[PDB]
């Protein structure tokens, strides 16, 4: 099974350049029936196709971004990368790399077979800041407060992924300080409060921070 994984910086300063790399796994990038492309999704907007390349090197871009975007492929490393020059604030989006399957007798008929996970790219001159995790001590509810981090995103797990039911990870909110604040809670029965232990696995990739906070009552 094909599986694509993005690997970008997450934060790029204005007027600088953005570089993301998409590594294909479970299958060779040097296949006749596949094109490899990039699609970005701005906050609260639709999907915008940036470009696409063939394993030989045949590039193809969207007219608006053709002046900036340059997508290259690396057969020896089994990956393809996007380079968007002169990045601006309007390019803050979630960049998805996708696998475009093509089959055809006369010309290829395309549909984007497999998609990537997505990279939250934020175009800002502000510096990176790691988060601070605080417990929300307590059917009773308990959670964690991930305050003062930049940029997005933050992924919060519970009990190393074992606890999943009834977990609500709220969307981040930008404070007046320019930093984001996130909250993730879970509703568990009151009887299990004393017996079972609860930990939230907060992870902030842009700052390379992984915090395992233990939430206890009182």
């Amino acid at each position: 099974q094909l599986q694509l994984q993005e690997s970008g910086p997450g934060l790029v300063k204005p007027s600088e350049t953005l570089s993301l790399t998409c590594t294909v796994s479970g299958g060779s990038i040097s296949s006749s029936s596949y094109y490899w492309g990039w699609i970005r999704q701005p906050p609260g907007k639709g999907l915008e196709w940036i470009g696409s390349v063939y394993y030989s090197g045949g590039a193809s871009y969207n007219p608006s971004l053709k002046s900036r975007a340059t997508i290259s492929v690396d057969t020896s490393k089994n990956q393809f990368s996007l380079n968007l020059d002169s990045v601006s604030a309007a390019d803050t989006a979630i960049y998805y790399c996708a696998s475009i399957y093509g089959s055809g007798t006369f010309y290829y008929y395309f549909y984007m077979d497999v998609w990537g996970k997505g990279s939250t790219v934020t175009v800002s001159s502000a510096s990176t800041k790691g988060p601070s995790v605080f417990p929300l001590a307590p059917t009773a509810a308990l959670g964690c407060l991930v305050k003062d981090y930049f940029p997005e995103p933050v992924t919060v797990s519970w009990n190393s992924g074992a606890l999943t039911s009834g977990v609500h990870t709220f969307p981040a909110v930008l404070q007046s300080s320019g930093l984001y604040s996130l909250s993730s809670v879970v509703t568990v029965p009151s009887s299990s409060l004393g017996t079972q232990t609860y930990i939230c696995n907060v992870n902030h990739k842009p700052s390379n921070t992984k915090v395992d906070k233990k939430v206890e009552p009182k």
């Binding site: 045949g58 590039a59 007798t105 006369f106």
Partner: protein
Amino acid sequence: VCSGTLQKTEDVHLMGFTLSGQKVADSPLEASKRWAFRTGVPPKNVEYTEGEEAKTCYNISVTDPSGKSLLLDPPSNIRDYPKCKTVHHIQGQNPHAQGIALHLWGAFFLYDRVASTTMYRGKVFTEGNIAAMIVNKTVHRMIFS
């Protein structure tokens, strides 16, 4: 056998009838499924005299991912089909493509007074076949007025 008489060699005419009149799919998606690329086959051409007014015509440009167009260079005698109701402008891609584009049904890519085995680059065409028939000078004048 002795039925019918041919006076001059100008009276024998070849009429090209579009596949549109045969009530086949005119959509370019289903029409693109009727063609394919194959190497090792020479392209042949036959000239005809009359043709039908086409319902849908196609101006296709299938290119390599590098940009190389895979369709053959049209010879000088090849020109756009005269009468088309709608002309679909299509730009395709095919990296694996080899050889030249042929018709899977055995039909011909109809050009102006020419039927071709291959689809030529940057030239409007329509799918169809031709038929041999005899109409004398007086009968031909009546149909076209």
